[PDB]
Swiss-Prot record:
This is Kelch-like ECH-associated protein 1. It comes from the Eukaryota. Belongs to the KEAP1 family. It comes from Mus musculus. The modification S-(2-succinyl)cysteine is found at residue 290. The modification S-cGMP-cysteine is found at residue 111. Changing residue 207 to A: Impaired interaction with SQSTM1/p62. Changing residue 160 to M: Impaired interaction with NFE2L2/NRF2.
Length: 290
């Protein structure tokens, strides 16, 4: 939590440059400075109050260019500034933050599906590669709980995945965890309480409305209430103890629906709608602008 839910980029017909922020306290949306380059399949995160947009791909009428970019948005100035780029382009990337360091995980570059992982140091403005995952994964969901980073699901070039793994920084090592009950690429992955949640995604045949959570202590995956809408390539974030899912694709429409999950009642409700339907957005939470 911090204040507003920011959604950056996305896709509808082509990649988008929108940056818009939703205030759950009053229902309003603000349109803010556009990204320098349109991108879908990116991930967002926040460190030190600043919003970062990482990776993705610019699908435009004249080209599909995978991105190795890291760009930072300062709400105090309503401006984007480039940062050092990653070692390699990464579309349909997963990102997590551990103690102020940004981990960029997996993703694709053309037909290459990465298992590589790299870590960004904001004050030093540098990226360095760390140990790669045990599995190549694009459309991978990533979240951090208790300073351990989890990469969940995705697609390896051949099969969509129900597997997941965890990175232990002090040993720079990855280990498989219990796999999910359901194959999911493009799921929204986040952390709430002591669990890693995987909502939606695509199982090889259908966009999903199911949601399951991994208890890091018991090592089990348990389904919770399903979302009202089936969605793959959705954005997700947690704010004030509730999960918010934004957009995605349901096999028919690029959704403008934003649903919110309340873990106390185990229910999802429709809470607002984005200004236009889109999938493949980056999402994160930070202070309101200006």
């Amino acid at each position: 939590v911090g204040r507003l839910i920011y959604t950056a980029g996305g896709y509808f017909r082509q990649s988008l440059s929108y940056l818009e922020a939703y205030n759950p306290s009053n229902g309003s949306w603000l349109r803010l400075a556009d990204l320098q380059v349109p991108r879908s399949g990116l991930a967002g995160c926040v460190v030190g109050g600043l919003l970062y947009a990482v990776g993705g791909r610019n699908n435009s009428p004249d080209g599909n260019t995978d991105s190795s970019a890291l760009d930072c948005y300062n709400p105090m100035t309503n401006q984007w500034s480039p940062c050092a780029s990653m070692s390699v382009p990464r579309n349909r990337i997963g990102v997590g933050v551990i103690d102020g360091h940004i981990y960029a995980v997996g993703g694709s570059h053309g037909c290459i599906h990465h298992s590589s992982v790299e870590r960004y140091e904001p004050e030093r403005d540098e990226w360095h590669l760390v140990a790669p995952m045990l599995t190549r994964r694009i459309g991978v969901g990533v979240a951090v709980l208790n300073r351990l980073l989890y990469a969940v699901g995705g697609f390896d070039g051949t099969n969509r995945l129900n597997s997941a793994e965890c990175y232990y920084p002090e040993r720079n090592e990855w280990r498989m965890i219990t796999p999910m009950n359901t194959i999911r690429s493009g799921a929204g992955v986040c952390v709430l309480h002591n669990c890693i949640y995987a909502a939606g995604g695509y199982d090889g045949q259908d966009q999903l409305n199911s949601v399951e959570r991994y208890d890091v202590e018991t090592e089990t995956w348990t389904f919770v209430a399903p979302m009202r809408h089936h969605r793959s390539a959705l954005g997700i974030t947690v704010h004030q103890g509730k999960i918010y899912v934004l957009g995605g694709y349901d096999g028919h429409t690029f959704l403008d629906s934003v649903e919110c999950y309340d873990p106390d009642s185990d229910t999802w409700s429709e809470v607002t709608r984005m200004t236009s339907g889109r999938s493949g957005v980056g999402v994160a939470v930070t202070m309101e602008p200006c």
